[PDB]
mmCIF file of C-alpha atoms and ligand atoms in Angstrom:
data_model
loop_
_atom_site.group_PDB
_atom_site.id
_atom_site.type_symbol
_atom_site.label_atom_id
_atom_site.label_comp_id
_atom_site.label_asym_id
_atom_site.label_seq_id
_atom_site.Cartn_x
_atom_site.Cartn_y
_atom_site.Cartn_z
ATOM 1 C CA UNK A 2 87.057 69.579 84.944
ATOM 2 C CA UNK A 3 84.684 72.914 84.996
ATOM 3 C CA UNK A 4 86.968 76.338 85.195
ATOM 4 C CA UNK A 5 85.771 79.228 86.390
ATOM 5 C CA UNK A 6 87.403 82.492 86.663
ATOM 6 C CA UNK A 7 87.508 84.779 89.538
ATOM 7 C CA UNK A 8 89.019 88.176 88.632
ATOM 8 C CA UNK A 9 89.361 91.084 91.389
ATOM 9 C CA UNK A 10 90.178 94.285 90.856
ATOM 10 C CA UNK A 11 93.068 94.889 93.612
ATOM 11 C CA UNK A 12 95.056 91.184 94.572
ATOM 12 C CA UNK A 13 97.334 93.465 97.131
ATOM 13 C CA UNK A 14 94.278 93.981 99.501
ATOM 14 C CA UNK A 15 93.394 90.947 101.831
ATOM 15 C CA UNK A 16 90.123 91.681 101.308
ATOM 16 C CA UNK A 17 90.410 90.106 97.656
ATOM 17 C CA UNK A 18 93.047 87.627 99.012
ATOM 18 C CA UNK A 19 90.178 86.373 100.916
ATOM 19 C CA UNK A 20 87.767 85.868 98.392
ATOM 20 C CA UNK A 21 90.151 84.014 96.699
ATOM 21 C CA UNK A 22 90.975 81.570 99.358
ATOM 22 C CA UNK A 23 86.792 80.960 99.740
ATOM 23 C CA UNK A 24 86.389 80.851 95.912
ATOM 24 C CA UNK A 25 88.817 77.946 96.340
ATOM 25 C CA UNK A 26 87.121 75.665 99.107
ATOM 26 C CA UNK A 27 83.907 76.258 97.171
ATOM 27 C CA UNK A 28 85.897 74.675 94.004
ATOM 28 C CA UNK A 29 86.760 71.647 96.357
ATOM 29 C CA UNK A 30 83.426 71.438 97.433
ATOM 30 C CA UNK A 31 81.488 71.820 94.434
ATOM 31 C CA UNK A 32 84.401 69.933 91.962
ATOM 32 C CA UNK A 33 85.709 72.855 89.528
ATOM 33 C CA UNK A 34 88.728 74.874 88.958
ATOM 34 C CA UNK A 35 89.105 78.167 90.308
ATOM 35 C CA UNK A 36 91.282 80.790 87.967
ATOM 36 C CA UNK A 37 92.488 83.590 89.712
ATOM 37 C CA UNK A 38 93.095 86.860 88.019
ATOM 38 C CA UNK A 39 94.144 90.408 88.817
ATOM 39 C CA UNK A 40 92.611 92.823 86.605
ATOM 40 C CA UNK A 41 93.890 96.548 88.219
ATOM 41 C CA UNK A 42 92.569 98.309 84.522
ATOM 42 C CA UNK A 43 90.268 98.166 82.012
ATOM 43 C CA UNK A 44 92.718 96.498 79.360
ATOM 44 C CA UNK A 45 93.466 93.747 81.110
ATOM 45 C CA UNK A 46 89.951 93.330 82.453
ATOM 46 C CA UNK A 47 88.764 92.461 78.818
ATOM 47 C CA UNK A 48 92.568 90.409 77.824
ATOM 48 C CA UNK A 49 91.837 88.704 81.039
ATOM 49 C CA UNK A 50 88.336 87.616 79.663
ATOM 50 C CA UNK A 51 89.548 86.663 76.164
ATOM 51 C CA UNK A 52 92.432 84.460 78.098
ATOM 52 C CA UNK A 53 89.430 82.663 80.057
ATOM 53 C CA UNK A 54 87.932 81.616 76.465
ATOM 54 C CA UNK A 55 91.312 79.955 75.843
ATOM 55 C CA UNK A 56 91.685 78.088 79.103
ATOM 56 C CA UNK A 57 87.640 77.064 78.254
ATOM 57 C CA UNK A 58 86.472 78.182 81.542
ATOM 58 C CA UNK A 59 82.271 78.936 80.975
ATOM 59 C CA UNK A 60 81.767 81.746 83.574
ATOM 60 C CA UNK A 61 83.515 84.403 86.106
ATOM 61 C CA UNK A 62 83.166 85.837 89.147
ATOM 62 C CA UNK A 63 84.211 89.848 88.859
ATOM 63 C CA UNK A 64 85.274 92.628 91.041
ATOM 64 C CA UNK A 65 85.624 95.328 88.124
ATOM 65 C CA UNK A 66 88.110 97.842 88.168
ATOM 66 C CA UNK A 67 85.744 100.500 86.588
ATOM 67 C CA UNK A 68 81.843 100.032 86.923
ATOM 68 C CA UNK A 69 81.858 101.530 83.843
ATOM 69 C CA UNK A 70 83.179 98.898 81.591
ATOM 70 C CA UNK A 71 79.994 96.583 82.550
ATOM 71 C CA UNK A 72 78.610 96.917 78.724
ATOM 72 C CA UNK A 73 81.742 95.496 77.748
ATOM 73 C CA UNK A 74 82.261 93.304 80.024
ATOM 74 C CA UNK A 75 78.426 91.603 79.244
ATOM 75 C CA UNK A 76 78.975 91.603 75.531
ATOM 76 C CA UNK A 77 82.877 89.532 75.600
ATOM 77 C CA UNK A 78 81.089 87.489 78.186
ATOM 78 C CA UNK A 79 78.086 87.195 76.072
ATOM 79 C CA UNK A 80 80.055 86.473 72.727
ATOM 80 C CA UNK A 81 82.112 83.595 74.405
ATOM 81 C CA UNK A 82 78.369 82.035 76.110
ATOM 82 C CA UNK A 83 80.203 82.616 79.886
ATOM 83 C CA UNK A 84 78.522 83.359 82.687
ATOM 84 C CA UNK A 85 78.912 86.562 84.432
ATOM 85 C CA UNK A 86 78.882 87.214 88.471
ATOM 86 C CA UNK A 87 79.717 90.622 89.926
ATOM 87 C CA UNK A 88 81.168 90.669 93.522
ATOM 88 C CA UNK A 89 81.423 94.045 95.368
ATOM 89 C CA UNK A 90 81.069 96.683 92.877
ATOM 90 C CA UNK A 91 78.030 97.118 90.836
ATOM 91 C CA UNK A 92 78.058 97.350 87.028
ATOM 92 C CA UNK A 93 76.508 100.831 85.598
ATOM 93 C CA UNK A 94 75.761 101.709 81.909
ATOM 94 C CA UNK A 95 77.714 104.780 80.192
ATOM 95 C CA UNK A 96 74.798 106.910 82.086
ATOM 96 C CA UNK A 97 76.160 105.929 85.401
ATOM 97 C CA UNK A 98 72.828 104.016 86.182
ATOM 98 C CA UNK A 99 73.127 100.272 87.802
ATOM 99 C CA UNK A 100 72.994 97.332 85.460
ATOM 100 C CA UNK A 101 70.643 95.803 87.544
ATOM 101 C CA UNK A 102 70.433 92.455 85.069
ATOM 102 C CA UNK A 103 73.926 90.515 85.704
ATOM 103 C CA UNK A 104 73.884 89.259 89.344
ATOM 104 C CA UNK A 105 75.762 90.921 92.339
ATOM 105 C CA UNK A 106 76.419 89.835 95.357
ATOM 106 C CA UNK A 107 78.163 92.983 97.845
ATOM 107 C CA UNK A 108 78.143 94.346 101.469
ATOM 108 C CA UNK A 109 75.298 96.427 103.198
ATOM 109 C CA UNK A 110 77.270 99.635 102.118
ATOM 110 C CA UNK A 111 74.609 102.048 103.758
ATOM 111 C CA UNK A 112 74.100 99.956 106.657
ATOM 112 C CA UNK A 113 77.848 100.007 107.529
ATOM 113 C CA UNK A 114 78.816 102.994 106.746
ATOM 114 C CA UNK A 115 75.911 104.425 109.029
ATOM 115 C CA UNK A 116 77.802 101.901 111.586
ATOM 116 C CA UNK A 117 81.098 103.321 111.388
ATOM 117 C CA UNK A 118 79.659 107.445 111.987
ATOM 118 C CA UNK A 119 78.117 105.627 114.739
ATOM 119 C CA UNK A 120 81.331 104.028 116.267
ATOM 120 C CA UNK A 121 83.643 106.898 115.371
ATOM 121 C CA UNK A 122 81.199 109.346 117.381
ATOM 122 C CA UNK A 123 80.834 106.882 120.017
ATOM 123 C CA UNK A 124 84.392 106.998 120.657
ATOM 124 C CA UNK A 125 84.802 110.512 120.201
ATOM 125 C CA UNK A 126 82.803 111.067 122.976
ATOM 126 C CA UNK A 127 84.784 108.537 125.282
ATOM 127 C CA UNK A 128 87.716 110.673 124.716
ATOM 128 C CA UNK A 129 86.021 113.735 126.142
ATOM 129 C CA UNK A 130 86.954 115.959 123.118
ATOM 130 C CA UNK A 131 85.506 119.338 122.448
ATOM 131 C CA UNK A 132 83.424 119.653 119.321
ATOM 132 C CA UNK A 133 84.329 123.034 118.710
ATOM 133 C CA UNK A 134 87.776 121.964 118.113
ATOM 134 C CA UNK A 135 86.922 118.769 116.068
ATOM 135 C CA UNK A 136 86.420 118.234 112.330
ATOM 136 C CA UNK A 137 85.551 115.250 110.460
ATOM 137 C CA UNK A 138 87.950 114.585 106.919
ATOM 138 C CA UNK A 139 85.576 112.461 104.728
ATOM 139 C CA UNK A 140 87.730 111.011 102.078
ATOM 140 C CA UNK A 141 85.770 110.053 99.150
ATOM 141 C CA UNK A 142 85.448 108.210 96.011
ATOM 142 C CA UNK A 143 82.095 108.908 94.764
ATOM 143 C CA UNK A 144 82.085 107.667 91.432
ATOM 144 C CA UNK A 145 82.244 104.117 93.027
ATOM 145 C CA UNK A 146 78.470 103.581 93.946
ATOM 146 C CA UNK A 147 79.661 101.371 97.291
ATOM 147 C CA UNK A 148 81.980 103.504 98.347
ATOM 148 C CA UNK A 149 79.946 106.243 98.041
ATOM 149 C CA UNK A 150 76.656 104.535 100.143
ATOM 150 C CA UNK A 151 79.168 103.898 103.249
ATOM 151 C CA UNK A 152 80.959 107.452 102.978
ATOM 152 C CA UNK A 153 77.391 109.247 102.484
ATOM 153 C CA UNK A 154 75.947 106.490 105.286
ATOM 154 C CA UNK A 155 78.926 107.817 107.811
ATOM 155 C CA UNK A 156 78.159 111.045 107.587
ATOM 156 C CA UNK A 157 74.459 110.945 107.819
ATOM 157 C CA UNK A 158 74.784 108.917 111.079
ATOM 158 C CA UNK A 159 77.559 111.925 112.381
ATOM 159 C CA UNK A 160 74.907 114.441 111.509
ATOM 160 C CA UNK A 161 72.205 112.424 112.992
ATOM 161 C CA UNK A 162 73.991 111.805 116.084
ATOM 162 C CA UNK A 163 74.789 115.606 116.701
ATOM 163 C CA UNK A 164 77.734 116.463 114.751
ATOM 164 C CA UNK A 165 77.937 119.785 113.182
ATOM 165 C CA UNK A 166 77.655 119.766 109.877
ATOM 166 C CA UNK A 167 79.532 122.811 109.382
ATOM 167 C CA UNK A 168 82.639 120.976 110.343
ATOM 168 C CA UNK A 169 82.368 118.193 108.108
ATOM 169 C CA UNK A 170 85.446 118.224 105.325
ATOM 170 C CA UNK A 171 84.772 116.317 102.579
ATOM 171 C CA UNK A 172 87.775 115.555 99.759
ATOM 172 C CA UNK A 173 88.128 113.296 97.062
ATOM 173 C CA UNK A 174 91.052 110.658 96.505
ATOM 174 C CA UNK A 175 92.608 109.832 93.243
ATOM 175 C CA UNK A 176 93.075 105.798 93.876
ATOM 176 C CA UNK A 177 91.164 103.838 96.667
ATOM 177 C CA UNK A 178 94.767 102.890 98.228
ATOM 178 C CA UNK A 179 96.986 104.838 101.106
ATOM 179 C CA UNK A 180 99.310 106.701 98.713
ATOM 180 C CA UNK A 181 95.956 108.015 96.962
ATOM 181 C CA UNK A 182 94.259 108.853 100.152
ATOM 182 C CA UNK A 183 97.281 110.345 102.384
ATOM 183 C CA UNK A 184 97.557 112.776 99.247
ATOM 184 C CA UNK A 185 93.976 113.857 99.812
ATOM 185 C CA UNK A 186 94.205 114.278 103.335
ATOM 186 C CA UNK A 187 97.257 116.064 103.573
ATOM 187 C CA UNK A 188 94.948 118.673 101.308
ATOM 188 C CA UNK A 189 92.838 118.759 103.571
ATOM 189 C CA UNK A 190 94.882 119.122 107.129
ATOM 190 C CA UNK A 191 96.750 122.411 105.821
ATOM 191 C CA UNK A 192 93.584 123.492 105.136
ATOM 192 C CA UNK A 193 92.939 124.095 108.625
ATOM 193 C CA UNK A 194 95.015 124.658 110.873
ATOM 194 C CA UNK A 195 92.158 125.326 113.485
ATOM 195 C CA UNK A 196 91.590 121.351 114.288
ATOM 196 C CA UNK A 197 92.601 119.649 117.514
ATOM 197 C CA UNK A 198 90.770 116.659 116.726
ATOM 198 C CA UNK A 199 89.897 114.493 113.275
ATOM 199 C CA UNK A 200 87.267 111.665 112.994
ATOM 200 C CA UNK A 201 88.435 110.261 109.664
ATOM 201 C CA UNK A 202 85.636 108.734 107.053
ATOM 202 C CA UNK A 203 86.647 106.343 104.425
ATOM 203 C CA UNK A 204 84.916 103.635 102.524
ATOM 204 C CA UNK A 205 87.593 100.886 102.998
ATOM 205 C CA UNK A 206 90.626 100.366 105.281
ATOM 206 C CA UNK A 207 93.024 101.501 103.222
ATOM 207 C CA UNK A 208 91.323 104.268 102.744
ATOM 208 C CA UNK A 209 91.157 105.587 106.161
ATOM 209 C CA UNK A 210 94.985 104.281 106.933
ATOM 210 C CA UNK A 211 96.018 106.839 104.191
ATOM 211 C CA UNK A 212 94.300 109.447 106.441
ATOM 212 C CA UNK A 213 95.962 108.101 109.718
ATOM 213 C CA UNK A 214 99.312 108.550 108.136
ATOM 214 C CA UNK A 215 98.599 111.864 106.498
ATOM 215 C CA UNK A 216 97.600 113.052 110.644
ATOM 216 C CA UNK A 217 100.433 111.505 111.669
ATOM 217 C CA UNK A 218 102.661 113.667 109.029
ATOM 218 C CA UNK A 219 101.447 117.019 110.537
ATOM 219 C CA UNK A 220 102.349 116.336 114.273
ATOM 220 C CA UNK A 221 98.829 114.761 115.480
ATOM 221 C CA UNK A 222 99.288 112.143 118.073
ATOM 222 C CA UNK A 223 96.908 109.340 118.147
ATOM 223 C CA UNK A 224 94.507 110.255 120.758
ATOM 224 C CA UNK A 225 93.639 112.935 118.906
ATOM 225 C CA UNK A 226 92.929 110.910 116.031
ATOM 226 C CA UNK A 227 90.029 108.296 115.142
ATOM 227 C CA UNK A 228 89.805 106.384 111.895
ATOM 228 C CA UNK A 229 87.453 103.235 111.628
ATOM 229 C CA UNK A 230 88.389 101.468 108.718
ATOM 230 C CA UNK A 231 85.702 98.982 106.949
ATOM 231 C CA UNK A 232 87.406 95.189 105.731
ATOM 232 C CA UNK A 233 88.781 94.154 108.728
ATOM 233 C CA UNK A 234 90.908 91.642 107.132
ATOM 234 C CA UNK A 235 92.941 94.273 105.905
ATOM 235 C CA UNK A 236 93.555 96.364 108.956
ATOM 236 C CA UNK A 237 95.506 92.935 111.095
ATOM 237 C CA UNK A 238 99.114 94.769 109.983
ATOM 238 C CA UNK A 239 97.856 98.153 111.824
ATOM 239 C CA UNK A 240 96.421 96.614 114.827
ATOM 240 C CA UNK A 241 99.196 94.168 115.178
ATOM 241 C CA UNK A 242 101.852 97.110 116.085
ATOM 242 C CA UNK A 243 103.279 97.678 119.715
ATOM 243 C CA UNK A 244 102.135 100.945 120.076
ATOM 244 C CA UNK A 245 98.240 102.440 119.598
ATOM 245 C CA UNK A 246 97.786 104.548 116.456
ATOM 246 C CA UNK A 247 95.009 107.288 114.860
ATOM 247 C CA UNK A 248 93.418 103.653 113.618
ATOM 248 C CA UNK A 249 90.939 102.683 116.331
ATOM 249 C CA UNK A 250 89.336 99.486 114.607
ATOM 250 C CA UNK A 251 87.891 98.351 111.747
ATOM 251 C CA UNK A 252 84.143 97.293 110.857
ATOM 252 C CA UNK A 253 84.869 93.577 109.671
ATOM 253 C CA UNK A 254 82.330 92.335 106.791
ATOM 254 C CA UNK A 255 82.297 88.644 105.305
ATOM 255 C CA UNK A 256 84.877 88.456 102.597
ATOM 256 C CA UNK A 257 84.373 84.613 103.269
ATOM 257 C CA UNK A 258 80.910 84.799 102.552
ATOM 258 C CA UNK A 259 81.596 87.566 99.316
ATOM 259 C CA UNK A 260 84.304 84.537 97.962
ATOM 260 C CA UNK A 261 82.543 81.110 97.967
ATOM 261 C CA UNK A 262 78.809 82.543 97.863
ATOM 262 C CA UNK A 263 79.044 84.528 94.582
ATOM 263 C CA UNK A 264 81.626 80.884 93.045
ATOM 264 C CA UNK A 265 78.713 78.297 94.558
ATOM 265 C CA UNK A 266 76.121 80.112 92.542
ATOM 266 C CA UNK A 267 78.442 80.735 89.439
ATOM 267 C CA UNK A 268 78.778 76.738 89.562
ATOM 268 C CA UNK A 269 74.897 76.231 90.037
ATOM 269 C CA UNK A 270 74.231 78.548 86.792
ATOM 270 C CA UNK A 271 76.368 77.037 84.332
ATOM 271 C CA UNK A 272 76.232 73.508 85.746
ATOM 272 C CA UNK A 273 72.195 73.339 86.515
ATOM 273 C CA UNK A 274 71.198 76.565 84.681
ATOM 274 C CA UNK A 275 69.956 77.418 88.526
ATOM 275 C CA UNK A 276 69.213 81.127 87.887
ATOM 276 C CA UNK A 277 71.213 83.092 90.842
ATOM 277 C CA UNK A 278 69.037 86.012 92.877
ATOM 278 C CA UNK A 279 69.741 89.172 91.355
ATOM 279 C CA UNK A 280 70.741 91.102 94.262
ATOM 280 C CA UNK A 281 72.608 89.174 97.634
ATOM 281 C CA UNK A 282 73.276 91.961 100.484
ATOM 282 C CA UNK A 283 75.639 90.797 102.950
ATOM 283 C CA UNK A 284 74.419 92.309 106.495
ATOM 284 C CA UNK A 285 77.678 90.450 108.798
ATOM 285 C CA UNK A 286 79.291 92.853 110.730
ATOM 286 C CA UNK A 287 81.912 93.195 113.701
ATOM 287 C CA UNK A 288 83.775 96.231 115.619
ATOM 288 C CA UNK A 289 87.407 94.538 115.678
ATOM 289 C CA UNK A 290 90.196 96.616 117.514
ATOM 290 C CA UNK A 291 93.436 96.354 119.236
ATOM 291 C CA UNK A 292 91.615 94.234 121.871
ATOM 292 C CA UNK A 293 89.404 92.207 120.275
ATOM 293 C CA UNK A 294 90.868 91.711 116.604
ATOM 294 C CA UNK A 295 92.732 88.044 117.099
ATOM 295 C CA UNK A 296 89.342 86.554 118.618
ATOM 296 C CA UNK A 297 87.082 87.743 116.289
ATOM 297 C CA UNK A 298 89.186 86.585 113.436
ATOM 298 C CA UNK A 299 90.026 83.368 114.480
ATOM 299 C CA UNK A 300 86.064 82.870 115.537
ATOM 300 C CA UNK A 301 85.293 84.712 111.797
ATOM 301 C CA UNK A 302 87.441 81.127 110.317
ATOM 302 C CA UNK A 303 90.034 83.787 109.195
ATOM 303 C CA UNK A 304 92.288 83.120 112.033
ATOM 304 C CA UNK A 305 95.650 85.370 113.075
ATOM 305 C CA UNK A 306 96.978 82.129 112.244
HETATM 306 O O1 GLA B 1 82.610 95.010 99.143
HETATM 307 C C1 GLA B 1 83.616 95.556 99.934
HETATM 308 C C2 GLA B 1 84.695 95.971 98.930
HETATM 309 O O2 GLA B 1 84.196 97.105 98.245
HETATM 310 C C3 GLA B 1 85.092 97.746 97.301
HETATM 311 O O3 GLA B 1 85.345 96.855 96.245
HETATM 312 C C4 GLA B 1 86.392 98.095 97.994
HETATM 313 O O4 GLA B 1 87.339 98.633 97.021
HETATM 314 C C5 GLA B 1 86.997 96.909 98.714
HETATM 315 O O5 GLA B 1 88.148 97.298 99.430
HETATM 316 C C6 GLA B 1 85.949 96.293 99.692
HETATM 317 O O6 GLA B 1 85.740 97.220 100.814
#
């Protein structure tokens, strides 16, 4: 009977996959229809949203392409009395500030991304490797808020931990994808030629995979290499392969959680008017890597299958 729409920026990433499978069990649960849409741009963000007024669905659950088009998205919403849920990335106004008013539910982006600085020097110093002849390549996309808070987080702990800041490389990416951030590191790597060793910061996966290949592309072989992605979900291809790559591991989160949470309280709004929390942080997190990733998945409900 109810509809509900659950729109995410980037359908090609498990992570989104994901929160479309949960968004489902919580519309067998709760007894609505879940309407999955892709909206990779701003245009079809806002088409997407008039197409939800056709199908009569009262309310969404969105992972916006561009924090920026929050105003927008609030006033179609508003105009067609829907509903409006943000999952992962936070709305801002045209000042860049967070719309702090529409509901979000996301991942502990500091928190994390202090966890992955931790893990990467952790490992680094398993290896033995000099830090004289080590650099960290933060990739960046800092006109995404989360993305930003786990990148900045990362560092911080690398600095904290002993790191020299000196030899932390920082360089933005284009597209939060591995074409987008294998351009961006390969930048960076002629840059200097000096480097024996990379630690690789990224806010997602992909992110850091783009980085991995990039290494790979200038003759570095994987031990001299450490990238922990964050998603975990979307790292199973990389840590499936025979051989060990630059990509250590991954720092899995709760897409589960991200997916039927943020429908469950869409439903409760527009079927009780139950008023959801403003802010829902989502602490969950896991070190999966070549050893570990099947059993953690599979005990995660997300299962190698
Ligand atoms: O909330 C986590 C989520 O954050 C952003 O939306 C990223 O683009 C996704 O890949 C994922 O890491």
């Amino acid at each position: 009977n109810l509809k509900l729409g659950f729109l995410v920026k980037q359908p090609e990433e498990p992570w989104f996959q994901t929160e479309w499978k949960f968004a489902d069990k919580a519309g067998k649960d709760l007894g609505f229809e879940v309407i999955k849409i892709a909206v990779p741009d701003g245009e079809k963000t806002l088409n997407a949203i008039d197409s939800l007024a056709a199908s009569g669905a009262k309310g969404f659950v969105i992972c916006t392409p561009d924090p920026k088009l929050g105003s927008a998205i609030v006033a179609k919403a508003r105009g067609y009395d829907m509903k409006v849920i943000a999952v992962d990335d936070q709305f801002v106004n045209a000042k860049g500030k967070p719309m702090d008013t529409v509901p979000l539910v996301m991942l502990a982006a500091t928190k994390i991304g202090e966890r992955q600085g931790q893990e990467l020097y952790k490992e680094m110093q398993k290896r033995g490797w000099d830090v004289k002849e080590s650099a960290v390549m933060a990739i960046t996309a800092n006109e995404l808020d989360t993305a930003r808070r786990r990148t900045t987080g990362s560092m911080d702990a690398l600095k904290a931990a002993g790191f020299p800041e000196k030899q932390i490389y920082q360089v933005p990416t284009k597209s939060n994808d591995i074409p987008g951030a294998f351009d961006a590191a390969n930048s960076m790597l002629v840059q200097h030629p000096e480097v024996k060793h990379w630690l690789i910061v990224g806010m997602n996966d992909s992110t850091v995979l783009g980085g991995v290949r990039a290494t790979e592309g200038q003759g570095f072989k994987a031990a001299d290499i450490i990238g922990i992605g964050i998603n975990g979900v979307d790292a199973v291809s990389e840590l499936s392969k025979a051989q060990a790559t630059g990509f250590y591991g991954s720092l899995l989160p709760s897409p589960d959680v991200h997916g039927y949470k943020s429908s469950e309280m869409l439903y409760n709004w527009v079927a009780k008017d139950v008023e959801p929390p403003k802010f829902t942080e989502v602490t969950d997190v896991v070190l999966i890597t070549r050893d570990n990733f099947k059993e953690e998945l599979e005990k995660k409900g997300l299962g190698g299958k």
